[PDB]
Every structure is written in structure tokens, then in C-alpha cells.
């Protein structure tokens, strides 16, 4: 078995190898990459997502989110308070203000220490989940707006044609902006490209050990656990590496820099934070190997998780017994 310790693997495809996206995913899996839950892909040196980022300041962040924490430094939840709209140029200035800027630090490890020590005492503002793309239309390789759609994958594998579309999302971050512990909707893959700015640190649990994280989360968030049988689908809970190590949960960490891709694999729990002002683009995708994970994916039916139009068909076809109850949650 390849990669039996479930380490995060880093790949350096040549420009020739960067042509065929599906084939490269299947190659990474042949080397065991999926066992970690997360992989890094450094694009060939000839490749570019677009020519420059010089003209992005007029993109609108219609609903910036202020991420307010409750709990203790290593075990907390966050809620998102909606703020007034602002442009990316306004948000960048805010991120660089004395109130919100990255503190002085020695290296990524010192910054990580400061994040875990101090995150809860601040409320950074995140421009998340903005439909759109920063890939130039002429970029032919690994263009996250030109991938094969999950609806077409389901149709190719299972023969059933379904409604729904699959488009990317932009994320504008600042120091301490946080993504809570989660897997993707329907335990899909994700791919994330860091277009510009400061790094993003990731934490991940191997898929084969995801239920260990879930059991710890039920112990640490006991009221949330009683409220919903899949409350990590709310995307609000944080647990530090120190707490994970104290409780024997297997995980790995890695920092993504501008110009790098990350891939998350089905049922790979992940969480992380941004080091300073940045912009990422991400989208879900599927392969044949995903279908069995989609069939088994947990669902939130309490009503909190509230997700896309396109998830309907996935539940209806892959999880017909759950369909009924899950849709009660969504309406
Ligand atoms: O970048 C972020 O805030 C969160 N992204 C992801 O969870 C992802 O790409 O799967
Ligand atoms: Mg603009
Ligand atoms: Ni994710
Ligand atoms: Zn729920």
C-alpha cells in the first residue's frame, strides 16, 4: 500500500504532465496521495493563471463576514456576522491596517504559535464564497473555471442525467481569517489555488481516520452534538493541533504559498487560517472513486447547514432514503 503513514505529498508536474487534469489526479492517487486527505501541487515553471493581478480592486465583496469566536484558545466556535459591502481594494486596505495586519514574526512556526494563542481575542473579516474566477480564459491547464462538472461525472459513471451546475468561488482573506473543520459537501474533492498574497496554513485528518475526529468533536462540543448528528457540516468548530495531539488524533499540517494548488480528497477533514491579505479560488470536483463516498456521506438535516441547489440531485440519486428528511432541513 502506497503512503501508509498518510503523509501529505507534494507534486511537481512537468508542463507535459499538466495537460490532462483527470489523469494527473489518478496518478497522484496511484502514489497514495489521497491517504493524507490533502496534497500540494506546484505548477510547472512555464505556467501562469493569468498575466497580472493589477486590475482586481473593483471586485465586490457583497457580504464580508466578521468571524467572532467563543470558547477557549484551542477549542472554539466561530459565528459569521455580516458586514456592509466593500470592494477588494477597500478590503485590502483594511487587512493592511494596524488593527488587522499580520504581527511581526520569525517564521511560519512562530506565526502559527501566535495564531493559536491569540485568535479568539480578535474578529477578522473574511470575503468568502464569492462566485467567480480569476483564471484567464486563455489558460488551458488547471483552469478551475474549465473543469469537467460533477453532474457530468455522475452521468458518465451512473448513467443518470441531473440538473445542476458547478462553478468556482473566490476567497479574500486577512490575518487570522479561519476555515473551520469540515469535509466537502457530499464528501467531494476540492481544489484550491492561492492566486496572490500571504500564505494559508492547512490542517488535515486522513480519510481513514475521520471518525476519530468526529468522536472527539462530539466530546468537545456536546450541545452542538445533541442538536445535530452531523454538526461539523455547519462549518463552525475549531480544534488546535495541541488539542488534537493530546487526544491522539492523527493529522498533518502544511503551508500553501501563492502560486500553489491544494487538493482535498473525499472525506479528508481540513481546517486552517490565512497569514495576511490573500486571494484563493476553489471548486469541488468528482472522480469515479468519489461515488462510493458520496453514497455514504453524512448529512445535516437540523437545518443549519443550508447548501446549494446542486446538492439536491446528489442526495436524491445517491441517497434516496435520506432524501425526504434532508430536504425538510433545506426547506
Ligand atoms: O480557503 C478557504 O477558506 C477554505 N477552502 C477550503 O475549505 C477548500 O478549498 O476546500
Ligand atoms: Mg476589478
Ligand atoms: Ni474545504
Ligand atoms: Zn445540522
From Swiss-Prot:
<keyword id="KW-0408">Iron</keyword>
<dbReference type="GO" id="GO:0046872">
    <property type="term" value="F:metal ion binding"/>
</dbReference>
<feature type="binding site">
    <location>
        <position position="300"/>
    </location>
    <ligand>
        <name>Zn(2+)</name>
    </ligand>
</feature>
<dbReference type="GO" id="GO:0031490">
    <property type="term" value="F:chromatin DNA binding"/>
</dbReference>
<feature type="binding site">
    <location>
        <position position="126"/>
    </location>
    <ligand>
        <name>2-oxoglutarate</name>
    </ligand>
</feature>
<keyword id="KW-0539">Nucleus</keyword>
<dbReference type="GO" id="GO:0000785">
    <property type="term" value="C:chromatin"/>
</dbReference>
<keyword id="KW-0832">Ubl conjugation</keyword>
<dbReference type="GO" id="GO:0005634">
    <property type="term" value="C:nucleus"/>
</dbReference>
<feature type="domain" description="JmjN">
    <location>
        <begin position="8"/>
        <end position="50"/>
    </location>
</feature>
<dbReference type="GO" id="GO:0010468">
    <property type="term" value="P:regulation of gene expression"/>
</dbReference>
<feature type="binding site">
    <location>
        <position position="234"/>
    </location>
    <ligand>
        <name>Zn(2+)</name>
    </ligand>
</feature>
<feature type="binding site">
    <location>
        <position position="302"/>
    </location>
    <ligand>
        <name>Zn(2+)</name>
    </ligand>
</feature>
<dbReference type="GO" id="GO:0032454">
    <property type="term" value="F:histone H3K9 demethylase activity"/>
</dbReference>
<dbReference type="GO" id="GO:0005721">
    <property type="term" value="C:pericentric heterochromatin"/>
</dbReference>
<dbReference type="GO" id="GO:0000724">
    <property type="term" value="P:double-strand break repair via homologous recombination"/>
</dbReference>
<feature type="binding site">
    <location>
        <position position="182"/>
    </location>
    <ligand>
        <name>Fe cation</name>
    </ligand>
</feature>
<dbReference type="GO" id="GO:0035563">
    <property type="term" value="P:positive regulation of chromatin binding"/>
</dbReference>
<feature type="binding site">
    <location>
        <position position="228"/>
    </location>
    <ligand>
        <name>Zn(2+)</name>
    </ligand>
</feature>
<keyword id="KW-0223">Dioxygenase</keyword>
<feature type="binding site">
    <location>
        <position position="192"/>
    </location>
    <ligand>
        <name>2-oxoglutarate</name>
    </ligand>
</feature>
<feature type="modified residue" description="PolyADP-ribosyl glutamic acid">
    <location>
        <position position="17"/>
    </location>
</feature>
<dbReference type="GO" id="GO:0072562">
    <property type="term" value="C:blood microparticle"/>
</dbReference>
<comment type="similarity">
    <text>Belongs to the JHDM3 histone demethylase family.</text>
</comment>
<dbReference type="GO" id="GO:0006338">
    <property type="term" value="P:chromatin remodeling"/>
</dbReference>
<feature type="modified residue" description="PolyADP-ribosyl glutamic acid">
    <location>
        <position position="16"/>
    </location>
</feature>
<protein>
    <recommendedName>
        <fullName>Lysine-specific demethylase 4D</fullName>
        <ecNumber>1.14.11.66</ecNumber>
    </recommendedName>
</protein>
<feature type="domain" description="JmjC">
    <location>
        <begin position="136"/>
        <end position="302"/>
    </location>
</feature>
<dbReference type="GO" id="GO:0001932">
    <property type="term" value="P:regulation of protein phosphorylation"/>
</dbReference>
<keyword id="KW-0560">Oxidoreductase</keyword>
<dbReference type="GO" id="GO:0035861">
    <property type="term" value="C:site of double-strand break"/>
</dbReference>
<feature type="binding site">
    <location>
        <position position="270"/>
    </location>
    <ligand>
        <name>Fe cation</name>
    </ligand>
</feature>
<dbReference type="GO" id="GO:2001034">
    <property type="term" value="P:positive regulation of double-strand break repair via nonhomologous end joining"/>
</dbReference>
<dbReference type="GO" id="GO:0071479">
    <property type="term" value="P:cellular response to ionizing radiation"/>
</dbReference>
<keyword id="KW-0805">Transcription regulation</keyword>
<keyword id="KW-0862">Zinc</keyword>
<dbReference type="GO" id="GO:0032452">
    <property type="term" value="F:histone demethylase activity"/>
</dbReference>
<keyword id="KW-0013">ADP-ribosylation</keyword>
<dbReference type="GO" id="GO:0003684">
    <property type="term" value="F:damaged DNA binding"/>
</dbReference>
<dbReference type="GO" id="GO:0006954">
    <property type="term" value="P:inflammatory response"/>
</dbReference>
<feature type="binding site">
    <location>
        <position position="235"/>
    </location>
    <ligand>
        <name>2-oxoglutarate</name>
    </ligand>
</feature>
<keyword id="KW-0479">Metal-binding</keyword>
